Design a protein around this motif. Sequence first.
Motif, PDB file in Angstrom:
ATOM      1  N   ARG A 142       5.558  -7.240  -5.126  1.00 12.25           N
ATOM      2  CA  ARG A 142       4.323  -7.555  -4.436  1.00 12.25           C
ATOM      3  C   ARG A 142       3.139  -6.937  -5.155  1.00 12.25           C
ATOM      4  O   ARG A 142       3.263  -5.899  -5.803  1.00 12.25           O
ATOM      5  CB  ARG A 142       4.344  -7.035  -3.007  1.00 12.25           C
ATOM      6  CG  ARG A 142       5.608  -7.294  -2.281  1.00 12.25           C
ATOM      7  CD  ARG A 142       5.453  -8.484  -1.424  1.00 12.25           C
ATOM      8  NE  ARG A 142       6.604  -8.702  -0.573  1.00 12.25           N
ATOM      9  CZ  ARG A 142       6.517  -8.911   0.727  1.00 12.25           C
ATOM     10  NH1 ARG A 142       5.331  -8.937   1.302  1.00 12.25           N
ATOM     11  NH2 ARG A 142       7.606  -9.097   1.447  1.00 12.25           N
ATOM     12  N   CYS A 143       1.992  -7.590  -5.037  1.00 13.77           N
ATOM     13  CA  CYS A 143       0.741  -6.941  -5.378  1.00 13.77           C
ATOM     14  C   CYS A 143       0.566  -5.722  -4.495  1.00 13.77           C
ATOM     15  O   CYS A 143       0.850  -5.765  -3.299  1.00 13.77           O
ATOM     16  CB  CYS A 143      -0.421  -7.904  -5.190  1.00 13.77           C
ATOM     17  SG  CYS A 143      -2.024  -7.156  -5.367  1.00 13.77           S
ATOM     18  N   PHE A 144       0.153  -4.612  -5.103  1.00 12.53           N
ATOM     19  CA  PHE A 144       0.036  -3.366  -4.361  1.00 12.53           C
ATOM     20  C   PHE A 144      -1.021  -3.473  -3.280  1.00 12.53           C
ATOM     21  O   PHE A 144      -0.841  -2.967  -2.173  1.00 12.53           O
ATOM     22  CB  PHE A 144      -0.301  -2.218  -5.303  1.00 12.53           C
ATOM     23  CG  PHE A 144       0.795  -1.866  -6.248  1.00 12.53           C
ATOM     24  CD1 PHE A 144       2.111  -2.008  -5.885  1.00 12.53           C
ATOM     25  CD2 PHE A 144       0.503  -1.381  -7.504  1.00 12.53           C
ATOM     26  CE1 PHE A 144       3.105  -1.684  -6.759  1.00 12.53           C
ATOM     27  CE2 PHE A 144       1.501  -1.058  -8.376  1.00 12.53           C
ATOM     28  CZ  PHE A 144       2.798  -1.206  -7.999  1.00 12.53           C
ATOM     29  N   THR A 145      -2.123  -4.149  -3.578  1.00 13.96           N
ATOM     30  CA  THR A 145      -3.237  -4.187  -2.645  1.00 13.96           C
ATOM     31  C   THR A 145      -2.943  -5.115  -1.479  1.00 13.96           C
ATOM     32  O   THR A 145      -2.949  -4.696  -0.320  1.00 13.96           O
ATOM     33  CB  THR A 145      -4.504  -4.610  -3.377  1.00 13.96           C
ATOM     34  OG1 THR A 145      -4.977  -3.517  -4.161  1.00 13.96           O
ATOM     35  CG2 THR A 145      -5.581  -5.021  -2.414  1.00 13.96           C
ATOM     36  N   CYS A 146      -2.659  -6.376  -1.765  1.00 12.38           N
ATOM     37  CA  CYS A 146      -2.594  -7.379  -0.719  1.00 12.38           C
ATOM     38  C   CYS A 146      -1.177  -7.748  -0.329  1.00 12.38           C
ATOM     39  O   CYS A 146      -0.928  -8.031   0.842  1.00 12.38           O
ATOM     40  CB  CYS A 146      -3.362  -8.626  -1.154  1.00 12.38           C
ATOM     41  SG  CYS A 146      -2.580  -9.580  -2.413  1.00 12.38           S
ATOM     42  N   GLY A 147      -0.230  -7.694  -1.246  1.00 16.63           N
ATOM     43  CA  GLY A 147       1.126  -8.053  -0.928  1.00 16.63           C
ATOM     44  C   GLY A 147       1.519  -9.447  -1.324  1.00 16.63           C
ATOM     45  O   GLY A 147       2.548  -9.930  -0.859  1.00 16.63           O
ATOM     46  N   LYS A 185      -5.815 -15.526  -7.638  1.00 14.96           N
ATOM     47  CA  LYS A 185      -7.254 -15.676  -7.491  1.00 14.96           C
ATOM     48  C   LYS A 185      -7.944 -14.334  -7.298  1.00 14.96           C
ATOM     49  O   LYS A 185      -8.948 -14.053  -7.953  1.00 14.96           O
ATOM     50  CB  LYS A 185      -7.565 -16.599  -6.313  1.00 14.96           C
ATOM     51  CG  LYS A 185      -7.011 -18.031  -6.395  1.00 14.96           C
ATOM     52  CD  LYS A 185      -7.685 -18.939  -7.434  1.00 14.96           C
ATOM     53  CE  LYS A 185      -6.974 -18.969  -8.787  1.00 14.96           C
ATOM     54  NZ  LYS A 185      -7.595 -19.937  -9.725  1.00 14.96           N
ATOM     55  N   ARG A 186      -7.427 -13.509  -6.395  1.00  9.38           N
ATOM     56  CA  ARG A 186      -7.988 -12.188  -6.165  1.00  9.38           C
ATOM     57  C   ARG A 186      -7.742 -11.305  -7.372  1.00  9.38           C
ATOM     58  O   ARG A 186      -6.683 -11.368  -7.991  1.00  9.38           O
ATOM     59  CB  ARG A 186      -7.359 -11.557  -4.929  1.00  9.38           C
ATOM     60  CG  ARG A 186      -7.849 -12.109  -3.620  1.00  9.38           C
ATOM     61  CD  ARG A 186      -7.164 -11.436  -2.455  1.00  9.38           C
ATOM     62  NE  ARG A 186      -5.731 -11.670  -2.464  1.00  9.38           N
ATOM     63  CZ  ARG A 186      -5.150 -12.701  -1.874  1.00  9.38           C
ATOM     64  NH1 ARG A 186      -5.884 -13.597  -1.238  1.00  9.38           N
ATOM     65  NH2 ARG A 186      -3.840 -12.845  -1.931  1.00  9.38           N
ATOM     66  N   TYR A 187      -8.717 -10.460  -7.704  1.00  2.97           N
ATOM     67  CA  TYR A 187      -8.559  -9.616  -8.877  1.00  2.97           C
ATOM     68  C   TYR A 187      -7.567  -8.490  -8.656  1.00  2.97           C
ATOM     69  O   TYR A 187      -7.232  -7.791  -9.612  1.00  2.97           O
ATOM     70  CB  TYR A 187      -9.906  -9.048  -9.327  1.00  2.97           C
ATOM     71  CG  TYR A 187     -10.617  -8.172  -8.337  1.00  2.97           C
ATOM     72  CD1 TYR A 187     -10.418  -6.806  -8.314  1.00  2.97           C
ATOM     73  CD2 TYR A 187     -11.520  -8.709  -7.449  1.00  2.97           C
ATOM     74  CE1 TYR A 187     -11.074  -6.012  -7.416  1.00  2.97           C
ATOM     75  CE2 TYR A 187     -12.182  -7.920  -6.550  1.00  2.97           C
ATOM     76  CZ  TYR A 187     -11.956  -6.575  -6.537  1.00  2.97           C
ATOM     77  OH  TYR A 187     -12.627  -5.800  -5.630  1.00  2.97           O
ATOM     78  N   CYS A 188      -7.100  -8.290  -7.428  1.00  2.05           N
ATOM     79  CA  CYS A 188      -6.055  -7.310  -7.199  1.00  2.05           C
ATOM     80  C   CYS A 188      -4.710  -7.797  -7.707  1.00  2.05           C
ATOM     81  O   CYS A 188      -3.917  -6.996  -8.201  1.00  2.05           O
ATOM     82  CB  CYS A 188      -5.979  -6.969  -5.716  1.00  2.05           C
ATOM     83  SG  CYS A 188      -5.538  -8.312  -4.613  1.00  2.05           S
ATOM     84  N   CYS A 189      -4.422  -9.093  -7.585  1.00  5.39           N
ATOM     85  CA  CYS A 189      -3.158  -9.619  -8.083  1.00  5.39           C
ATOM     86  C   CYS A 189      -3.216  -9.888  -9.568  1.00  5.39           C
ATOM     87  O   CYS A 189      -2.182  -9.894 -10.234  1.00  5.39           O
ATOM     88  CB  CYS A 189      -2.786 -10.908  -7.363  1.00  5.39           C
ATOM     89  SG  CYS A 189      -3.047 -10.882  -5.620  1.00  5.39           S
ATOM     90  N   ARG A 190      -4.408 -10.138 -10.090  1.00  4.38           N
ATOM     91  CA  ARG A 190      -4.551 -10.391 -11.510  1.00  4.38           C
ATOM     92  C   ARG A 190      -4.337  -9.135 -12.329  1.00  4.38           C
ATOM     93  O   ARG A 190      -3.837  -9.219 -13.447  1.00  4.38           O
ATOM     94  CB  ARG A 190      -5.919 -10.983 -11.788  1.00  4.38           C
ATOM     95  CG  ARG A 190      -6.149 -12.274 -11.071  1.00  4.38           C
ATOM     96  CD  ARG A 190      -7.594 -12.644 -11.115  1.00  4.38           C
ATOM     97  NE  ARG A 190      -7.993 -13.043 -12.449  1.00  4.38           N
ATOM     98  CZ  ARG A 190      -7.939 -14.288 -12.892  1.00  4.38           C
ATOM     99  NH1 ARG A 190      -7.498 -15.245 -12.102  1.00  4.38           N
ATOM    100  NH2 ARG A 190      -8.324 -14.573 -14.120  1.00  4.38           N
TER     101      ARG A 190
HETATM  102 ZN   LIG Z   1      -3.298  -8.888  -4.493  1.00  7.69          ZN
END
Ligand SMILES: [Zn+2]
Lengths: 406, 29, 66, 258, 115, 78, 141, 59, 44, 192, 51
Positions: free
Chosen positions: C6-11, C41-46
């Motif tokens: 998972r992305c740490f920020t959003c999941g 799309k979100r820079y947290c997953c990028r």
């Molecule tokens: Zn994310």
Amino acid sequence: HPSMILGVCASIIPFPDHNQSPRNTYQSAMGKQAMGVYITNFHVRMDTLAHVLYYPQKPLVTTRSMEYLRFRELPAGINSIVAIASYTGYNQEDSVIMNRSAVDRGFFRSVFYRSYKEQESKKGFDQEEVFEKPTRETCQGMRHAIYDKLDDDGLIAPGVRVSGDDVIIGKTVTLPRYTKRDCSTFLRTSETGIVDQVMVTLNQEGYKFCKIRVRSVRIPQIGDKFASRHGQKGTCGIQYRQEDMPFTCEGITPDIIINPHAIPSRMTIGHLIECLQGKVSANKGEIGDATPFNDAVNVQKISNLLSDYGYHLRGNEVLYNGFTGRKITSQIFIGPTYYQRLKHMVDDKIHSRARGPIQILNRQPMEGRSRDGGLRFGEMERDCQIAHGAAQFLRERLFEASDPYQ
Amino acid sequence: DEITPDLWQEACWIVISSYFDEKGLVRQQ
Amino acid sequence: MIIPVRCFTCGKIVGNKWEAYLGLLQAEYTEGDALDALGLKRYCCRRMLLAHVDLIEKLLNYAPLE
Amino acid sequence: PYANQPTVRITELTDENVKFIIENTDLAVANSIRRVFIAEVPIIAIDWVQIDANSSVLHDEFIAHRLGLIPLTSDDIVDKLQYSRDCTCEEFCPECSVEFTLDVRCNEDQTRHVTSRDLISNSPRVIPVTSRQDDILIVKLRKGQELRLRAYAKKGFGKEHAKWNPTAGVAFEYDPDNALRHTVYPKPEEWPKSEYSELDEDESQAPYDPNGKPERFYYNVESCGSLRPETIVLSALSGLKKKLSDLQTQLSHEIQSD
Amino acid sequence: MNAPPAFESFLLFEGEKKITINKDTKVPNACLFTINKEDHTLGNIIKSQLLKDPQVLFAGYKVPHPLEHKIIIRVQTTPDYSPQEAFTNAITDLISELSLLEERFRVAIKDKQEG
Amino acid sequence: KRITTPYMTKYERARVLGTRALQIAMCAPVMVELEGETDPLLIAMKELKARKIPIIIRRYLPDGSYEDWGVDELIISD
Amino acid sequence: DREVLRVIFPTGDSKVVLPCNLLRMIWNAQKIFHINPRLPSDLHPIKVVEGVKELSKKLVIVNGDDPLSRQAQENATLLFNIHLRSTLCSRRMAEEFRLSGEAFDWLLGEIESKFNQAIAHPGEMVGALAAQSLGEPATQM
Amino acid sequence: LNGLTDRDLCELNECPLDPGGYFIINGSEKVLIAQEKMATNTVYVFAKKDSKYAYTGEC
Amino acid sequence: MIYICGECHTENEIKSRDPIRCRECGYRIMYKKRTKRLVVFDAR
Amino acid sequence: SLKQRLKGKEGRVRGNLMGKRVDFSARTVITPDPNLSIDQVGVPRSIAANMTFAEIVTPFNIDRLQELVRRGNSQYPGAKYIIRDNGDRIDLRFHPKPSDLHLQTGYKVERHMCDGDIVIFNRQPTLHKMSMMGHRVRILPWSTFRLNLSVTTPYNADFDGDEMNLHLPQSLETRAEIQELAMVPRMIVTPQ
Amino acid sequence: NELIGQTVRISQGPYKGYIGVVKDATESTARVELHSTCQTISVDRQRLTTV
RNA sequence: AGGGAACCCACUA
Ligand SMILES: [Zn+2]
Ligand SMILES: [Mg+2]
Ligand SMILES: [Zn+2]
Ligand SMILES: [Zn+2]
């Protein structure tokens, strides 16, 4: 290139010419304490202490000198979405609020390795030491522990759990109704983990020689020390879940919230430039260049690039309160910043004593947390308790709670 | 002929890359 | 070592997108266009894919114990 | 007698997100709905891993941690599934958990990718989401390495662990034009307009409405795959209603037992 | 080492009581509703639905400490009304609002899924 | 004839409260009507406010002599 | 008292360190008793003079009646009595502070209590206090 | 490990990124910290202060 | 007791109070196999 | 030699008589807590379940201390020892025979440190007398000492890795004099 | 006391499914170090299952 | 129900 005046640990600082120079010194000190993957063959090595991060990331904002430090290959840290905000007061005076949901997803999780060794050394024809599982009816001085974790060779097996009063190596020395004494090796007190690897060999002297590696997974918690690459260290003050964290209009909660007050007296402006450049890098898909003396990169160019991605050019965002849902009146500086998890954990530092071992000479409590020792109520503490007038507290500290005698 | 000011920032890191390609970082030891 | 699930920020799930990302990178995509084609799309997953270091490829270079 | 009468508009409904607008409700109700999306919508996730063999380069807690984060299709099963702390079975039964097993050995001379396809369930409808795209990589195995494990996936909600969070990103927004001055821009022209802004390019903020309160709320509930996003919203409304009902029952007991 | 289990956010341990009323004598017609194992999710909606009531003179919630899982709601009413009745009415209005929201959401999902 | 201060010093207050609390914890007869009280410190404080602590403070002058002040004779600041 | 002050403070610096903040205590008396400063006062000036005299008689640092002890008492409370007679002047209590009779009686009692709270407690380790008070700012320099 | 490829280093359970430069002494990796000193054979003239010598040229 | 050789990875029958060495290659570093006990992790 | 044993900061006098290692002391990292009062310190449960205060048994607290003895050293709000009048220590970590758990008036029960307990809390270097103040124990989940934020100025503390020391007064007399002399509210204004 | 040293499974309560080895036991309470986490909890002996 | 000392080095605030 003029950035070859920096060494290995100062070449990892992004924008070090935008930082006050003691902060560059502090990051050079604290990049050595940062947890990553220290070497690729760490599964073979029985180092006494080892710290491996679960998910090291290379920085989004890099210097060009970190292509030669191999920091892209063995990185020590995670790019964290970091808001610079005053949230609930738990990040004050160099602290960090962390996302509990991120930490649940593996953010800054790490594994700790402790290695223990024992020689099965025969010392003469009188005192013989054996790797074997002791029994009550045969061995004298067994430490009232759990001894059936050990196998038949006296050594524990990989996969077994151990707490601070568990035996991992069973060593008995033959005694000149008790034929031998127990000289077994236990874990460190107030420690825990899985036995990871037991390696049996023989040393130069030809005696049986074991090394046992015990691994424990260290989840980040309150009081664990995290630092950015700009001398901005600080313990975790609290962890909020994702629904308690402030969020942007697209649902991005910060992984870490640092205090605004950490910036002005320290003047780590390279930290803010790295957040801005990391926002640009994460939206663009590039890895930003933060080589020190560069005219191709200034704050206005980074700002224009950031405003090209539908963001505020200065990196602020409208955050909403996680508890009430209301917009925060101030717009919060938030962006990806490279944080390091430092080796200074709180579970390696918490110590209490009530009554325990005492030194053989002066009968005062022992030295240090590794042997259940007490804390030195030193001379300055004595002087302060004199200044308080607290004569009886001074008397119990320096007489009753250390070494009463008749 | 010579390195122009627009090619300089890549020329210098090419020569630094060549330096570290041979010497490494523990060459003094 | 290996790509986070998972992305740490959003999941958001990013653990299924690493080999696809590398395949797009081998197909002469720019990194931003590869992240756009994967739906990050979100820079947290990028920054999960952008900053990932695949160390498990290095750890598979050692012969197993058993 | 002072209840709101909130209306709903769906503006986008994909298999991965629902984008909707709620009018005529209070900000606290809207935020609690957004919080129950993240924290109180129960899904099925692995919470019990027995590892019979693990020769991989990643240790056992690493593998287990990665297995817990794999999303499982929780639709229509999680509602009739029991919390294991409430279930009367001794260890694990089909009324409270779903059993997964993985058994991969790499004997081929190239690297084996242990994905979520290799996770095999006994229930035919609680499977990995990526198995139902590309699959979620758990570990890469070298030749001769193997990973054999047994996993149980119980019901839980994201307030306990984030692996029970059903959502990827819950976008939330109210008053895009800042007509209530809930945020005060130092320079309003430096700020990009929202997706929902009704202003033309000339104007930066709406005029300040002194009589206004937040009334219209914009959501974009992306789903990580376990539930459909509309199931996330409906389960959140049911869960919030159930929390209020349980609180009202306990409060009725405490009032009548004064 | 000192990590609380993740389930004490929401599980009452044996002997813990979900909600207690304490009629504080500092001001007339006020109560202190101490709700255990709850957070801002219910505290905020209950507080706002109480603020919609014109017979409620004060409504506020607090989490005394975020490392504990406990909500203190303080409600003060006009003398012809009681804080317990205000709390019950607020929960009924919240339940009716969420029921209406769920039904209209189902209608909207069914309309958009068809078209 | 008593030249020392009529007020009880803070060191005197701390030590009288500690001594009296220890005496009560050793089941000395309480001088005041405790109302649901259990902790000996609160009982000692309640005795001190009521000016009922049965303790004499012997203040030593630097010349060697002493003055005996009862707790009930000294002015109670805190 | 003015000439004595001129001798003691020859640089003309009026900032002193004294126990009872008399101006704030007068302000407290004005607010407690709702002293209207637009009305004539009911406080006799001779009440002010006698009250300050009998207040100075009970602000006692040196206890005794022989001339050595009363001289040491007059020395130990010299600035505080100069400041007390300057602040509770009969002209300033009528022209400036405008306190009533009950406000002035409260003010006298509060000055006496605050002064007796300011006296050093016997037993106090003032040498260690002084050593730490001069020592920890030395860490700053 | 001199002149070995990355594959040969990984065959020996060594890290190809490991730089070397240390000694294994009883299983402990020991690094020799470089020590600085005055240069030899160079004439340095200093002013010894508060001493009987006004100037001092050492070599 | 069963040990794994470090370099040839062959299983070895090793008794007590005998020298550590491989039956096949004579390499003197041996590794114990994983335990047979129930190891259970919460997937967290 | 004997002179080397008696001299220096590490010798007998300066290192073992003027200052010494003490029992009933704790040390861990300090983290902020804006929700604590200025005279509270948030204490981890492991530190509190390891540090004990000897409470003398009275008829007032026969039942509470009996319950604490019944809980034992395993449960946190419990006890570690019973000290009889003759002076022997019944260790409650061995879960002894139930004749030992009897409590008479005059017994001492070494109960675990609980909420509201008075502690001296200290940061080195102890420069002035507000570097060592008294605090009321509040038990909080995780592993750090927790301080209020106004309190960090006398301690000269921040939360970038500072560790502070917690001494538990063992007598009622010394607990009383810490309460009446050295608590944080009494240390607000300095004589310096 | 045969419970000490035995691998045990918690069968009732919030810790249901946790595995561990008992460290010290009473007739009604055991100190079970959890295999899953890094804690030694106290659990009532009615909620324990040996294996 | 607890058999080490000494020195060196690195580190923490
Ligand atoms: Zn994310
Ligand atoms: Mg500090
Ligand atoms: Zn079941
Ligand atoms: Zn071999």
